[PDB]
Amino acid sequence: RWSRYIGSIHTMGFATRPTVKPVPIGSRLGFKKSSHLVRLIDTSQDRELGRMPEDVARILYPLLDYSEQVSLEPYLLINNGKRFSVGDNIYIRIDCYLTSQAFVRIHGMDTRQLHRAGAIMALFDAINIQPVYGDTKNEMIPNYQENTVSSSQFQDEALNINQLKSFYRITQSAASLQNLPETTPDESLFKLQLRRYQKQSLSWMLKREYEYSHLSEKMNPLWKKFRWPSNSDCFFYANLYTGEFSIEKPVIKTIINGGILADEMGLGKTISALALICTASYDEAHEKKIESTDTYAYRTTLIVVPMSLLNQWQSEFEKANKDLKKRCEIYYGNNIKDLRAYVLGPNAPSVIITTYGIIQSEYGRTSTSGLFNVVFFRIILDEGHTIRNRSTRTSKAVIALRSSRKWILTGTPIINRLDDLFSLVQFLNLEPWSHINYWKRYVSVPFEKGNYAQAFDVINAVLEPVLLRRTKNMKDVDGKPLVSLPPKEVIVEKLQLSSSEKRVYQSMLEDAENSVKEGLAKGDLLKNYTNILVHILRLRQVCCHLDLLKPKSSISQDKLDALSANFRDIHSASEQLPSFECAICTTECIEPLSAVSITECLHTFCEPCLAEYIEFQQNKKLSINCPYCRMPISEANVLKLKEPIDAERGYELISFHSHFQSTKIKALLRHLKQIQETSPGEQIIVFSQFSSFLDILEIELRSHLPRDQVIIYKFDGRLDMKERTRILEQFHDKDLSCIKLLLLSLKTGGVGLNLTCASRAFMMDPWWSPGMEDQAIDRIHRIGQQQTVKVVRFIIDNSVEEKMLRIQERKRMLGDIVEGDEAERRQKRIEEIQMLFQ
Ligand SMILES: [Hg+2]
Ligand SMILES: [Hg+2]
Ligand SMILES: [Hg+2]
């Protein structure tokens, strides 16, 4: 035990009790603890003398609780040789000492610990003691107290795209990261070729797991160094954030296993994670411990991944893994009966891939089968910004997962709020920042009160040792960008027509071929040139959508989800089995459940009873109304329960009749549903030459995609200029919470339309000229762009569209307009038709 002085405070006090004999100048005063009123007493008279000012009482009052930790010895400064009157000023010098009972003495007690760390921090501000810096440019300042540091210009927790690009500009702009060593995995266990940056992330990820056995022979930003005073060793160290002090320099190494791998999309995060698994797939230290002399899955790596990427991960693992001894399986649909026994058993798989929705579903119903009665070896979250909402069942589920090593693979750790990082920290369990009180007191509140640079330094301080972030725009040591971004990548995706679509396309081909046989049997093929191109056009329309030749349900998937929610709310589980009445025959219990017919307004019928009503009302051509409440019920809006009934989900309302989706719209939706989780905020452009096809696409896309995650913009081309630019205005509005689609016509192209924000293009149909399609795509990419423009061309296999592509290939070889008289032009007209029908 010892004591030591660190600073003094000079302040006047207001007299409370008069003094008969004036107090000595060097009076050894004291502080008694009882808008805050801390009392100033003396040691001789044992009476009260004064009340301190408010701004000084706020500093003294909480410090008196830590008496053994920080003692305050106030001395008297001026004696006017007079009895203290009622209101005289008491000039005091408060000598502040530090006792070893605070120094190096380090149940949900965050409030007790922050109150100390804060009162101590306010004490330092009063005595105006500052740390020592040792670099050429000075680092961060001490974080200030509550309702201080010039709090002004209140800012919301939600972030601007400008505000967000400023956050990245500091965490991705760490020190030189181009000198990270390259770890190359041997081809005995891994059959892919990592890039230069991928070998760096592997070495860093192995370093983060402290796997030094796979490296080739390869302080404390929050703490700061203070200096003792010398009036009334020469250094000490402290962390004002937690109130912890240490006589020696605390070089506490990194503690958590793993980290966050944030990288711009296109740097191969998935491949780097796989290289990590193929290098270290089990806890070697645990294996030796158990045999040299339980719920730990010391050999299994759990990968939680979006649903739309569940099969790609299984695929990419098989394409990369060479060691057959380590197996990889997908946990989905309760396929593994006792997963707890599986991952702990002798045949434990090395990798298990599953969905957040599976993690969410098993957390809610208290699934003791697995995933939560087992501590995994390594958890890897792909697109980890899913858990960014602290209050959703999915986040609570992920945070409940236990593992020795944790990884977060996300290209965008912050979507639209600063505290999206908190759950990333809460997952990694970074004490004390996993605790919410530590986060809201040192990051949230200072940010919410406009002192944002203060919060960004704290954020950048905790994530720097744990987060690694590289950018495709970064330069290597040789002088090259990490990724050579081409202007565009165009890919032809061949599709095959549905069973119904082929029968239509084959019928239209007869009329096309028959018209060729007519003109050819009349001595001149061009005599039916106009009549031929008509049938060729109809074939082209059949490829896009059959409705382009000449009832549709009026309920979107968002509405069905809402109707299903209400239906499960009306018919809730209870002691007895679930039963459904019928509005026509008053049957208390409809059997079977597949015979239940539910109207647009959620009223239950027997499927024959409702059908009999509709047939009877349609045979008399009378407006259809619900037999129960007399509301407009459309026949296409009749609903039924999905068969079978999912026990984990409940009743699901699907359309009674089925509706037709063309092969191309089915394929586009297949892409879009995957881009949502692949890359947040992306602007996609959808080209088609047929305007009515764009009208169909708008209706189908908005019906099959959630509104809060996919926003559809369609350029009517028949609107005033201010609205058209207002559409582009909202289309260039980058929103990482959704993806934006611009449906515009290939005919007009992008003439006078800025389309630079687009990262992806979808060509829904080909045209006679390659120039028009090329010109539309070429107005999206501009040199000096962050992302290459990914283009997909949907072409119906063995159809006219495949033929038109061959015509374009001809034009590119010769030209679009190679002039010539009507003698040379007939040959081109004939050859084009031959190329269409061969
Ligand atoms: Hg019925
Ligand atoms: Hg009804
Ligand atoms: Hg050809």
Side-chain angles (χ1 to χ4, degrees):
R1 180 181 292 174
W2 52 259
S3 188
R4 192 163 177 176
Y5 154 86
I6 75 174
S8 47
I9 305 164
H10 302 75
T11 302
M12 52 166 295
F14 284 65
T16 295
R17 300 290 302 277
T19 305
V20 178
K21 295 179 178 180
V23 285
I25 297 186
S27 288
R28 182 62 181 85
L29 297 185
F31 272 131
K32 184 187 183 70
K33 188 179 56 181
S34 308
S35 300
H36 308 280
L37 297 187
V38 55
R39 295 302 175 174
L40 171 86
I41 63 177
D42 53 2
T43 46
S44 304
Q45 193 65 60
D46 287 7
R47 295 176 186 165
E48 172 190 357
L49 183 63
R51 57 172 176 95
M52 305 297 294
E54 184 68 19
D55 300 333
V56 189
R58 298 184 181 274
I59 317 293
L60 302 173
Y61 179 83
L63 288 176
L64 300 181
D65 305 349
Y66 305 95
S67 297
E68 293 309 320
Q69 290 200 329
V70 180
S71 59
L72 301 168
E73 305 192 359
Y75 289 60
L76 180 63
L77 263 182
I78 291 188
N79 175 11
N80 280 335
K82 186 183 180 179
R83 62 179 301 276
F84 270 136
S85 298
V86 185
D88 285 6
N89 318 284
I90 307 170
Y91 296 110
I92 312 160
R93 186 179 58 93
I94 301 172
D95 284 350
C96 309
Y97 300 72
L98 285 190
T99 302
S100 58
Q101 294 299 98
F103 213 97
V104 66
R105 203 184 166 266
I106 66 187
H107 293 295
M109 69 193 83
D110 304 333
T111 312
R112 290 288 302 273
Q113 198 166 255
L114 285 180
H115 179 262
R116 183 181 171 279
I120 286 188
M121 179 188 280
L123 171 69
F124 275 39
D125 211 330
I127 65 178
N128 194 46
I129 173 182
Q130 299 165 6
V132 196
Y133 301 149
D135 206 69
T136 63
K137 54 175 186 176
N138 286 333
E139 272 275 357
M140 43 173 300
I141 64 180
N143 192 303
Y144 296 72
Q145 300 77 15
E146 168 63 22
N147 288 111
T148 317
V149 69
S150 73
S151 48
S152 61
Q153 291 312 310
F154 265 100
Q155 252 177 355
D156 194 9
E157 192 75 19
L159 259 62
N160 188 343
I161 192 67
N162 292 326
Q163 293 171 339
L164 177 53
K165 291 189 175 181
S166 299
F167 166 82
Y168 286 145
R169 199 187 294 177
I170 300 180
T171 188
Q172 91 201 349
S173 172
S176 183
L177 57 89
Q178 60 183 28
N179 294 97
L180 277 160
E182 299 179 13
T183 295
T184 304
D186 65 324
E187 295 180 355
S188 309
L189 309 189
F190 194 80
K191 51 181 185 176
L192 281 186
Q193 300 293 337
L194 298 182
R195 300 286 182 89
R196 294 187 180 273
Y197 49 92
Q198 292 180 341
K199 296 177 182 178
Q200 296 175 322
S201 46
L202 177 53
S203 179
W204 175 81
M205 283 193 284
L206 292 173
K207 182 185 72 68
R208 291 301 313 116
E209 296 188 11
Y210 312 132
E211 218 76 19
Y212 303 110
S213 306
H214 303 94
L215 302 173
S216 92
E217 299 300 320
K218 302 308 187 157
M219 302 300 298
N220 220 313
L222 266 186
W223 289 70
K224 281 190 295 184
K225 178 180 182 183
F226 286 53
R227 178 181 304 176
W228 293 96
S230 47
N231 296 324
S232 69
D233 194 8
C234 296
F235 297 97
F236 75 100
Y237 305 83
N239 173 270
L240 304 187
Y241 291 102
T242 59
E244 300 189 330
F245 300 76
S246 61
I247 179 62
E248 305 177 351
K249 184 179 174 181
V251 186
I252 307 297
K253 298 184 177 183
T254 61
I255 295 186
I256 65 159
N257 288 279
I260 293 174
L261 195 153
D263 263 337
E264 278 195 350
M265 188 190 60
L267 289 170
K269 299 186 288 302
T270 307
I271 306 179
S272 297
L274 294 181
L276 168 60
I277 303 177
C278 297
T279 292
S281 65
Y282 72 97
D283 196 353
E284 295 184 349
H286 185 253
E287 187 188 42
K288 294 175 181 176
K289 258 185 175 180
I290 189 174
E291 66 175 22
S292 301
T293 187
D294 183 24
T295 57
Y296 185 30
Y298 79 107
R299 289 171 299 181
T300 309
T301 301
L302 180 69
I303 299 175
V304 180
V305 64
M307 175 66 180
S308 316
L309 317 174
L310 181 59
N311 294 329
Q312 175 191 308
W313 268 89
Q314 179 73 28
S315 167
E316 287 301 314
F317 184 92
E318 295 168 0
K319 293 177 181 176
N321 184 21
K322 184 65 180 176
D323 189 5
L324 301 171
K325 305 287 296 295
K326 43 198 185 210
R327 305 172 298 112
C328 168
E329 194 173 353
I330 290 182
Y331 181 60
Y332 181 85
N334 302 287
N335 50 34
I336 297 173
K337 314 176 191 307
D338 194 338
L339 187 142
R340 174 178 187 172
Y342 193 21
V343 294
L344 303 184
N347 298 289
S350 273
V351 173
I352 286 195
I353 307 173
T354 191
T355 300
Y356 290 88
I358 296 293
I359 307 287
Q360 181 270 344
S361 175
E362 297 211 336
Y363 172 87
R365 67 169 197 270
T366 316
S367 181
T368 50
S369 57
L371 273 182
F372 287 95
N373 310 115
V374 155
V375 180
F376 287 96
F377 173 60
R378 181 192 300 109
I379 293 175
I380 294 176
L381 299 169
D382 191 20
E383 310 302 304
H385 55 262
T386 319
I387 65 187
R388 70 182 197 272
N389 191 335
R390 179 175 69 257
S391 71
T392 56
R393 181 134 61 246
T394 305
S395 304
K396 307 185 186 180
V398 177
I399 298 176
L401 297 181
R402 295 176 282 179
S403 73
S404 168
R405 306 172 185 187
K406 297 187 177 179
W407 284 103
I408 300 181
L409 278 58
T410 183
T412 52
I414 297 195
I415 293 308
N416 52 13
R417 286 173 69 95
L418 194 60
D419 52 7
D420 296 348
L421 291 180
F422 176 72
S423 45
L424 273 62
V425 174
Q426 205 174 4
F427 178 76
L428 291 172
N429 191 80
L430 274 166
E431 306 278 327
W433 311 105
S434 174
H435 298 268
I436 181 67
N437 298 145
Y438 277 80
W439 188 272
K440 290 190 302 180
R441 174 137 178 278
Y442 291 175
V443 170
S444 278
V445 155
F447 180 84
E448 294 163 2
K449 285 188 181 60
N451 196 204
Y452 67 97
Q454 187 66 258
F456 282 38
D457 287 3
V458 181
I459 290 179
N460 190 92
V462 313
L463 291 183
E464 176 187 11
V466 156
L467 194 156
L468 166 52
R469 184 172 174 91
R470 301 185 296 270
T471 293
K472 295 131 59 183
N473 296 328
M474 300 187 58
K475 313 300 192 307
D476 209 6
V477 191
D478 298 336
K480 294 186 174 182
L482 264 66
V483 179
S484 57
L485 300 165
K488 60 180 174 178
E489 169 194 5
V490 189
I491 288 181
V492 185
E493 180 162 327
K494 287 187 191 299
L495 314 174
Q496 291 172 0
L497 295 176
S498 175
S499 50
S500 52
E501 306 190 69
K502 287 185 187 176
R503 184 163 44 256
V504 184
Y505 178 88
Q506 201 65 25
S507 174
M508 296 308 313
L509 181 53
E510 289 190 29
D511 303 355
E513 291 182 352
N514 284 8
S515 183
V516 174
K517 300 178 184 180
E518 292 177 17
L520 193 140
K522 294 307 178 179
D524 188 10
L525 176 62
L526 308 186
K527 190 179 176 175
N528 285 330
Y529 187 77
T530 300
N531 199 255
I532 287 179
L533 294 184
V534 165
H535 294 105
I536 289 291
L537 176 61
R538 288 169 169 180
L539 288 172
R540 295 155 55 194
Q541 302 168 343
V542 163
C543 299
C544 291
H545 193 285
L546 291 184
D547 279 0
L548 305 179
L549 296 179
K550 303 300 296 182
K552 56 204 296 177
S553 55
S554 66
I555 287 178
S556 62
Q557 182 67 14
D558 293 3
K559 184 91 174 186
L560 278 185
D561 298 7
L563 292 179
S564 299
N566 290 7
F567 198 84
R568 298 188 299 268
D569 207 21
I570 301 176
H571 309 82
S572 295
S574 60
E575 295 282 351
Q576 54 190 127
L577 298 164
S579 59
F580 300 91
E581 294 195 34
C582 172
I584 299 182
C585 61
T586 70
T587 290
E588 299 264 11
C589 179
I590 300 175
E591 294 281 22
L593 292 186
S594 75
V596 175
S597 192
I598 306 146
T599 63
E600 180 187 350
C601 47
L602 304 198
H603 287 114
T604 54
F605 292 81
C606 292
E607 193 276 335
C609 267
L610 182 60
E612 284 178 20
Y613 171 86
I614 302 180
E615 291 184 7
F616 171 80
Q617 295 293 104
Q618 286 169 340
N619 264 324
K620 294 186 177 181
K621 293 179 172 295
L622 306 178
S623 61
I624 306 294
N625 287 273
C626 185
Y628 193 67
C629 69
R630 301 152 298 275
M631 279 299 123
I633 59 136
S634 309
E635 186 177 356
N637 298 338
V638 177
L639 308 172
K640 68 182 182 182
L641 303 174
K642 181 173 152 185
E643 193 177 359
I645 294 183
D646 193 317
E648 296 172 340
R649 296 302 179 185
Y651 306 104
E652 291 170 302
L653 291 178
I654 60 182
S655 186
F656 176 73
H657 313 267
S658 70
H659 196 50
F660 168 67
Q661 307 166 236
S662 76
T663 303
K664 293 196 167 185
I665 293 187
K666 281 182 59 183
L668 177 61
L669 287 160
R670 184 171 60 250
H671 284 254
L672 299 177
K673 292 183 179 188
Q674 186 147 325
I675 300 171
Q676 300 187 28
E677 279 83 36
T678 305
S679 38
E682 275 226 345
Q683 295 93 339
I684 310 170
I685 290 188
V686 178
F687 284 111
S688 180
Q689 64 188 282
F690 315 107
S691 177
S692 46
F693 191 23
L694 292 185
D695 298 329
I696 293 180
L697 279 158
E698 160 173 284
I699 300 182
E700 287 291 307
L701 294 168
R702 199 168 305 170
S703 181
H704 295 72
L705 299 177
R707 184 57 180 178
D708 66 328
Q709 300 171 4
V710 176
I711 304 183
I712 289 89
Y713 303 97
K714 181 169 74 71
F715 243 55
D716 206 315
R718 303 174 64 187
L719 315 166
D720 56 5
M721 181 183 63
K722 266 305 176 183
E723 183 180 359
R724 294 196 300 102
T725 53
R726 190 188 62 87
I727 292 180
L728 299 177
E729 186 172 22
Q730 289 194 326
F731 177 62
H732 288 70
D733 197 5
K734 191 78 166 179
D735 186 9
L736 305 191
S737 74
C738 72
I739 58 169
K740 296 191 174 179
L741 263 58
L742 185 57
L743 281 54
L744 68 90
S745 169
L746 190 150
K747 313 266 207 181
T748 69
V751 188
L753 275 70
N754 181 9
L755 307 178
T756 309
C757 60
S759 315
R760 296 177 193 266
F762 277 105
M763 317 295 293
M764 303 304 281
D765 42 22
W767 202 65
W768 306 105
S769 178
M772 184 168 292
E773 275 178 287
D774 279 336
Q775 172 178 123
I777 294 169
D778 287 335
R779 295 183 57 77
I780 295 179
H781 69 79
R782 300 300 173 87
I783 178 176
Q785 61 178 21
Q786 320 81 325
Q787 283 176 317
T788 184
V789 183
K790 300 177 182 175
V791 189
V792 180
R793 319 184 60 181
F794 290 136
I795 288 302
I796 296 302
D797 196 11
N798 294 287
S799 74
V800 201
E801 295 184 335
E802 186 168 296
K803 301 299 190 177
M804 291 176 68
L805 258 54
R806 304 179 186 178
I807 292 183
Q808 292 182 13
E809 296 170 24
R810 179 62 54 83
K811 267 78 169 296
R812 291 204 183 92
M813 167 137 293
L814 308 176
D816 215 336
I817 309 152
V818 178
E819 276 72 358
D821 286 3
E822 253 181 339
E824 301 82 17
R825 180 160 35 213
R826 292 176 196 171
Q827 270 298 288
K828 300 300 296 180
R829 285 185 174 180
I830 293 175
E831 183 183 3
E832 278 193 7
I833 300 181
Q834 298 181 358
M835 294 178 64
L836 292 178
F837 286 87
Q838 64 167 22

